[PDB]
Each structure stands twice: as C-alpha cells, then as structure tokens.
Design a protein around this motif. Structure first.
Motif, mmCIF file in Angstrom:
data_model
loop_
_atom_site.group_PDB
_atom_site.id
_atom_site.type_symbol
_atom_site.label_atom_id
_atom_site.label_comp_id
_atom_site.label_asym_id
_atom_site.label_seq_id
_atom_site.Cartn_x
_atom_site.Cartn_y
_atom_site.Cartn_z
ATOM 1 N N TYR A 63 0.841 -1.012 -0.066
ATOM 2 C CA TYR A 63 0.007 -0.095 0.083
ATOM 3 C C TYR A 63 0.764 1.084 -0.054
ATOM 4 C CZ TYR A 63 -3.910 -3.241 0.794
ATOM 5 O OH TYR A 63 -5.019 -4.239 0.526
ATOM 6 N N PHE A 280 -5.563 -10.439 3.114
ATOM 7 C CA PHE A 280 -5.804 -9.165 2.702
ATOM 8 C C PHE A 280 -7.221 -8.956 2.152
ATOM 9 C CE2 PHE A 280 -1.492 -6.779 2.245
ATOM 10 C CZ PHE A 280 -0.980 -7.817 3.224
ATOM 11 N N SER A 281 -7.676 -7.998 2.319
ATOM 12 C CA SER A 281 -9.006 -7.304 1.682
ATOM 13 C C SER A 281 -8.959 -7.480 0.339
ATOM 14 C CB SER A 281 -9.423 -5.989 2.119
ATOM 15 O OG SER A 281 -10.422 -5.461 1.404
ATOM 16 N N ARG A 284 -9.614 -4.120 -1.439
ATOM 17 C CA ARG A 284 -8.470 -3.121 -1.201
ATOM 18 C C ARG A 284 -7.280 -3.667 -2.165
ATOM 19 N NH1 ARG A 284 -5.477 -1.275 4.249
ATOM 20 N NH2 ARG A 284 -4.688 0.508 3.491
HETATM 21 CL CL LIG Z 1 -5.532 -5.626 3.347
#
Ligand SMILES: [Cl-]
Ligand SMILES: [Cl-]
Length: 303
Positions: A63, A280-281, A284
């Motif tokens: 990210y 993880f999402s 996202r």
């Molecule tokens: Cl995530």
C-alpha cells in the motif's frame, strides 16, 4: 547514533512527495521493512493473517509503494546481502521479493550492504537518490538521500492527541559537507568513525559530536590524529585499524548486475498471494492494483 547526532548542523531540505514526482529512488529494503514491521499495527501488535503470521511488512510494502508511485515516485528496493565481518527473518524477505515481483516493482540483491548498493546506484546515475531512515548511504557516497520516504504522513499522539506530521526530507552530500565545514566525503567517513557506525557502534566515548567534528576539521583526518595526544583513547576504542574501517565505506562491495524496470502488476497473482494466502481485503488489493497501473501509466505518458 552517528551522523544523526549532528542533525542540528545537517538540517535537511523538508519537502513533500509530489516534489519528488519523476524521481527514481533506491530504497533500502531492510530499513523499509523495519519501519513497516514497527509502525503498522493493530491494538499494539503487528498485523497478522488468520494463521497468526505477520503481515505488516506486506501491508506496508504493497500500500505504501502504491502511494509513492501515485505521487510519481519510482522506487527500487535494494536488499542486504552478506554483511562485512565487523557488522530480518528470511521468510519476511522472501515474502517481500515475491510481492514486488507480483507488483512489477524492481528490486536488487546487493552483494553486501544494501545502503552501499543504493548509494552506488545513485552515484552511477541509475537513480536520483537513496531512501532510508539511516544516514549510511551518504558515507557510501550517495549524492542525495531522502529520509522519511516510507513513513510520510500524520498521526495522533496516543498521549497528547497532537497531530504529528512526518514529511520527506532531502540531504545532498555536497551540502552536508558544506554544512559541516568539511572538504570531502573521506573526512565525513573519518568523522563517522569517531562518532560510531554499525562497524564500530560504541564510537569513541569521551569525544562528543562537536568535538569529533572540530578534530576532523582542525587536523584534517583520522590518520593525522596519530601524531596528537588524543590518539591512544581513539586506538583503544576502535575495534579494527582505521584504514580498514575507511575502506568499508569508501570501497564498499557493490554490483553492476541490475537493470531497472517498472512492469505491470499481476492482479490475479497478487490476489492469490495476499488475499487467498494472507487474508488481505480483496477489494482493497484489487483497487491498489488498479491505482498502481494508472500511476505507472501517468509516468509513462511523459517519459
Ligand atoms: Cl488489506
Ligand atoms: Cl492506503
């Protein structure tokens, strides 16, 4: 601590990320992962997947790298090899490399010190600067070091609730020398040896930073401090002969064997790795992949 002790004199150029649009930056991977592991947390502990395995490193690397590329910054991550004799769990490192490959973000395996490899890439003009919380890359001859690149942002103090802001900051080797009143990188290295490095972390107790600097300026070099009275105290505390310490910074082991590319991310591989193996999402991750493709594209269409 080292050059960090002369922070009042060094004073970097405080900037923002958009000012680094178009810059290639060699980011020390071990330093970056350490920031991710120690600052990305949930209820006082690192992020973990549903099997209890740490994920803060993957979270930050995905990210925050995407955020950097959105500001127009082109990162290359450089990994420590075998340290020199005087000098992170390997699974975290292999996770990192797998992730960057899936993201299309380049990385380099350094033969020894990562920070030295970063500095060498900057000296060769393959990147504009090195990027780390440590000042080491300057001693390895980087013309420019950007600090805070992996941790730009705002937070609230748990105690005071004040808005702590961290901004990227640039230090140019030439200006650092001028700020310190030194002639060369060689003196900077001699200064650093007095203050203490990773290769001699005690420094020389009894010589504070200002004193260290005055000595180097007055007498010129560590070699020339031999004829002075302070030498025995120095020789006592330096673990190895000074020239071998100097050689580590001035002639670090580094490699030519890299070629820097920023490729397209592999959306489905990223999902397999981060979502299906590490919880993880999915929304996202997929959105981060789209943001990354668009950011790369925006850099492409100007060269
Ligand atoms: Cl995530
Ligand atoms: Cl985010």
């Amino acid at each position: 601590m080292g050059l960090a002790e002369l922070r009042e004199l060094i004073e970097p150029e405080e900037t923002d990320l958009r000012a680094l649009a178009g810059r290639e930056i060699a980011i020390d991977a071990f330093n970056a992962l350490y920031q991710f592991l120690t600052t990305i947390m949930k209820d006082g502990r690192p992020l973990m997947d549903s099997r209890g395995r740490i994920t803060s490193h993957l979270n930050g690397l995905l990210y925050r790298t995407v955020n950097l590329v959105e500001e127009g910054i082109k990162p290359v991550y450089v990994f420590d090899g075998e340290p020199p004799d005087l000098k992170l769990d390997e699974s975290l490192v292999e996770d990192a490399k797998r992730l960057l490959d899936l993201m299309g973000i380049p990385w380099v395996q350094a033969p020894s010190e990562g920070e030295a490899q970063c500095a060498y890439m900057a000296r060769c003009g393959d990147v504009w600067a090195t990027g780390s919380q440590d000042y080491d890359s300057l001693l390895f001859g980087s013309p420019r070091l950007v600090r805070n690149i992996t941790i730009v942002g705002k937070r609230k103090h748990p105690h005071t609730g004040e808005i702590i802001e961290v901004k990227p900051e640039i230090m140019r080797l030439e200006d650092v020398l001028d700020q310190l009143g030194l002639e060369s990188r060689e003196q900077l290295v001699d200064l650093a040896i007095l203050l203490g490095t990773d290769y001699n972390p005690d420094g020389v107790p009894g010589i504070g930073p200002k004193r260290a600097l005055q000595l180097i300026r007055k007498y010129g070099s560590l070699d020339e401090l031999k004829d002075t009275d302070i030498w025995p105290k120095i020789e006592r505390h330096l673990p190895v002969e000074p020239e071998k310490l100097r050689r580590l910074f001035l002639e670090p082991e580094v490699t030519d064997d890299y070629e820097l590319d920023w490729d397209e991310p592999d959306e489905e591989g990223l999902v397999e790795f981060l979502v299906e193996e590490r919880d993880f999402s999915e929304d996202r991750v997929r959105r981060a992949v789209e943001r990354l493709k668009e950011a790369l594209q925006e850099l492409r269409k100007g060269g």
